[PDB]
Design an enzyme around this catalytic site. Structure first.
Site, PDB file in Angstrom:
ATOM      1  N   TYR A 193       7.719  44.456  10.395  1.00  0.00           N
ATOM      2  CA  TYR A 193       9.383  43.737  10.438  1.00  0.00           C
ATOM      3  C   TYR A 193      10.083  42.820  10.973  1.00  0.00           C
ATOM      4  CZ  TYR A 193      14.003  45.361  11.509  1.00  0.00           C
ATOM      5  OH  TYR A 193      15.410  45.636  11.717  1.00  0.00           O
TER       6      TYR A 193
ATOM      7  N   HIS B 125      20.262  55.203   6.813  1.00  0.00           N
ATOM      8  CA  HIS B 125      19.208  53.936   7.041  1.00  0.00           C
ATOM      9  C   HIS B 125      17.828  53.968   7.542  1.00  0.00           C
ATOM     10  CE1 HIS B 125      19.558  49.478   7.126  1.00  0.00           C
ATOM     11  NE2 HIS B 125      19.043  49.815   8.534  1.00  0.00           N
ATOM     12  N   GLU B 126      18.635  55.157   9.138  1.00  0.00           N
ATOM     13  CA  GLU B 126      17.774  55.332   9.904  1.00  0.00           C
ATOM     14  C   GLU B 126      16.477  55.670   9.714  1.00  0.00           C
ATOM     15  OE1 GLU B 126      17.899  52.226  12.090  1.00  0.00           O
ATOM     16  OE2 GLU B 126      19.978  52.068  12.318  1.00  0.00           O
TER      17      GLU B 126
ATOM     18  N   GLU C  81      14.472  45.808   5.379  1.00  0.00           N
ATOM     19  CA  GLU C  81      16.311  46.358   6.097  1.00  0.00           C
ATOM     20  C   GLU C  81      16.514  47.058   4.614  1.00  0.00           C
ATOM     21  OE1 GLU C  81      18.236  46.472   7.878  1.00  0.00           O
ATOM     22  OE2 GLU C  81      16.773  46.615   9.007  1.00  0.00           O
TER      23      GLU C  81
ATOM     24  N   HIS D 117      17.960  40.719   8.756  1.00  0.00           N
ATOM     25  CA  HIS D 117      19.513  41.631   8.931  1.00  0.00           C
ATOM     26  C   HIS D 117      20.306  41.205   7.940  1.00  0.00           C
ATOM     27  CE1 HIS D 117      18.132  44.141  12.179  1.00  0.00           C
ATOM     28  NE2 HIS D 117      18.878  45.211  11.210  1.00  0.00           N
TER      29      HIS D 117
ATOM     30  N   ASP E  70      17.288  37.234  14.911  1.00  0.00           N
ATOM     31  CA  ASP E  70      17.098  37.945  13.882  1.00  0.00           C
ATOM     32  C   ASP E  70      15.672  38.638  13.763  1.00  0.00           C
ATOM     33  OD1 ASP E  70      17.966  40.954  12.817  1.00  0.00           O
ATOM     34  OD2 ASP E  70      18.719  39.333  11.126  1.00  0.00           O
TER      35      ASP E  70
ATOM     36  N   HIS F 192      13.731  53.799   7.644  1.00  0.00           N
ATOM     37  CA  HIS F 192      12.186  53.172   8.443  1.00  0.00           C
ATOM     38  C   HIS F 192      11.862  53.787   8.241  1.00  0.00           C
ATOM     39  CE1 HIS F 192      15.084  49.173   8.701  1.00  0.00           C
ATOM     40  NE2 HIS F 192      16.172  49.820   9.339  1.00  0.00           N
TER      41      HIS F 192
HETATM   42  N1  LIG Z   1      22.086  47.444  13.439  1.00  0.00           N
HETATM   43  C1  LIG Z   1      22.217  45.274  12.650  1.00  0.00           C
HETATM   44  C2  LIG Z   1      23.557  45.673  13.630  1.00  0.00           C
HETATM   45  C3  LIG Z   1      23.823  45.487  14.186  1.00  0.00           C
HETATM   46  C4  LIG Z   1      25.094  45.115  15.555  1.00  0.00           C
HETATM   47  C5  LIG Z   1      25.150  45.493  16.946  1.00  0.00           C
HETATM   48  N2  LIG Z   1      26.601  44.757  17.509  1.00  0.00           N
HETATM   49  C6  LIG Z   1      21.607  45.220  13.791  1.00  0.00           C
HETATM   50  O1  LIG Z   1      20.643  45.495  14.535  1.00  0.00           O
HETATM   51  O2  LIG Z   1      21.273  43.856  13.909  1.00  0.00           O
HETATM   52 KR   LIG Z   2      22.958  50.509   9.394  1.00  0.00          KR
HETATM   53 ZN   LIG Z   3      17.356  48.650   9.988  1.00  0.00          ZN
END
Ligand SMILES: N[C@@H](CCCC[NH3+])C(=O)O
Ligand SMILES: [Kr]
Ligand SMILES: [Zn+2]
Ligand SMILES: CC(C)[C@H](N)C(=O)O
Ligand SMILES: [Ca+2]
Ligand SMILES: [Ca+2]
Ligand SMILES: [Ca+2]
Ligand SMILES: [Ca+2]
Ligand SMILES: [Kr]
Ligand SMILES: [Kr]
Ligand SMILES: [Kr]
Ligand SMILES: [Kr]
Ligand SMILES: [Kr]
Ligand SMILES: [Kr]
Ligand SMILES: [Kr]
Length: 316
Positions: A157, A142-143, A166, A231, A226, A146
């Site tokens: 983003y 996943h990372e 995402e 996400h 967010d 990106h």
């Molecule tokens: N990677 C996601 C979920 C992470 C949750 C961390 N407690 C975000 O940054 O929103």
């Molecule tokens: Kr992830």
């Molecule tokens: Zn991501």
């Protein structure tokens, strides 16, 4: 570092033994010379200065508990490189075998992982919400995806383009997990999330609503947290991708599944040839439809299934 290529052995976060490509020069370093311009793994030593120190080990054995996140960051970056090369003829994230750099032991009790524009960064988790996040191959992939997106479509983003960003990372994180084929699934982060709770995950692509994420455009989040729900609203696209691959009937709309390989080809083509930094959900549908048309023909089952899937989640 300049040295000779070697092969170390160690255990990952989940206690599995694996071989890792290293480099010897007085110490053994987590430097894999077998893939592109190299895969390099660093120790952030519980601080937030990046990248930290290139990981050095005296005996090329990596079985200490402190070693485990490094072993997995290193090994799964390799698997992800192999996926993009073997499956999509893409050489690392920039397509010109850029070195892949990762840092582990970032900060203290850090419950996240990220791509910072230049490298991957993994927290160790606090031991209750997360264990070290490089233990999840879908997380690593996943990372790194990106990075691929940043060098290709460049999806901004935030808001809908960010939710696509995402979703692309969840889709290819999942396809890499299936490629490695160790109990793969359509859930995100299950291997490193809540060690005290069985069967859960951070997100679900098969049923986003399980964790409160929308599975239909009509349920999209339009607020500001967010980054405008990147996400959260990713669940709408994740569900569409899941339907394209696996099929199903969703709010009464039936989709014929065409499988993971074709999902991957269609979305990789959309990502690299059609999506732009400002693409919204409707524009993703068009890109996916045109990608499927390019690959399979305008009257193909593949194009019909892409259309069904976006219909099912209310996009266009
Ligand atoms: N990677 C996601 C979920 C992470 C949750 C961390 N407690 C975000 O940054 O929103
Ligand atoms: Kr992830
Ligand atoms: Zn991501
Ligand atoms: C796991 C972690 C990731 N960056 C979220 O989503
Ligand atoms: Ca050692
Ligand atoms: Ca799994
Ligand atoms: Ca998974
Ligand atoms: Ca769990
Ligand atoms: Kr190896
Ligand atoms: Kr690489
Ligand atoms: Kr870096
Ligand atoms: Kr990659
Ligand atoms: Kr876990
Ligand atoms: Kr929702
Ligand atoms: Kr959205």
């Amino acid at each position: 570092i300049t040295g000779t290529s070697t092969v170390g052995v160690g255990r990952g976060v989940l206690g599995d033994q694996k071989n890792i490509n290293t480099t010897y020069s007085t110490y053994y370093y987590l430097q894999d010379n077998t893939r592109g311009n190299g895969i390099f793994t660093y120790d952030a030593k519980y601080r937030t200065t990046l990248p930290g120190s290139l990981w050095a080990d005296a005996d090329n054995q990596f079985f200490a508990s402190y070693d485990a996140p490094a072993v997995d960051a290193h090994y799964y970056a390799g698997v992800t490189y192999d996926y993009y090369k073997n499956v999509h003829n893409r050489l690392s994230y920039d397509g010109n075998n850029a070195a892949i750099r990762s840092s582990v032991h970032y900060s203290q009790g850090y419950n996240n992982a990220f791509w910072n524009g230049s490298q991957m960064v993994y927290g160790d988790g606090d031991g209750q919400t997360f264990i070290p996040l490089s233990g999840g191959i879908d997380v690593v992939a996943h990372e790194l995806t990106h990075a691929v997106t940043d060098y290709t479509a460049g999806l901004i983003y935030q808001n809908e383009s960010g939710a696509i960003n995402e979703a692309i990372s969840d889709i290819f994180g999942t396809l890499v997990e299936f490629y490695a084929n160790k109990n793969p699934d359509w859930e995100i982060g299950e291997d490193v999330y809540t060690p005290g709770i069985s069967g859960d995950s951070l997100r679900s692509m098969s049923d986003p609503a399980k964790y409160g994420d929308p599975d239909h455009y009509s349920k999209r989040y339009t607020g500001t947290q967010d980054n405008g729900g990147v996400h959260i609203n990713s669940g709408i696209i994740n569900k569409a991708a899941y339907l394209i691959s696996q099929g199903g009937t969703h709010y009464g709309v039936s989709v014929v599944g065409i499988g993971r390989d074709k999902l991957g080809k269609i979305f990789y083509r959309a990502l690299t040839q059609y999506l732009t930094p400002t693409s919204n959900f409707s524009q993703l549908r068009a890109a996916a439809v045109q990608s499927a048309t390019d690959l399979y023909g305008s009257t193909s089952q593949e194009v019909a299934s892409v259309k069904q899937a976006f219909d099912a989640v209310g996009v266009k």
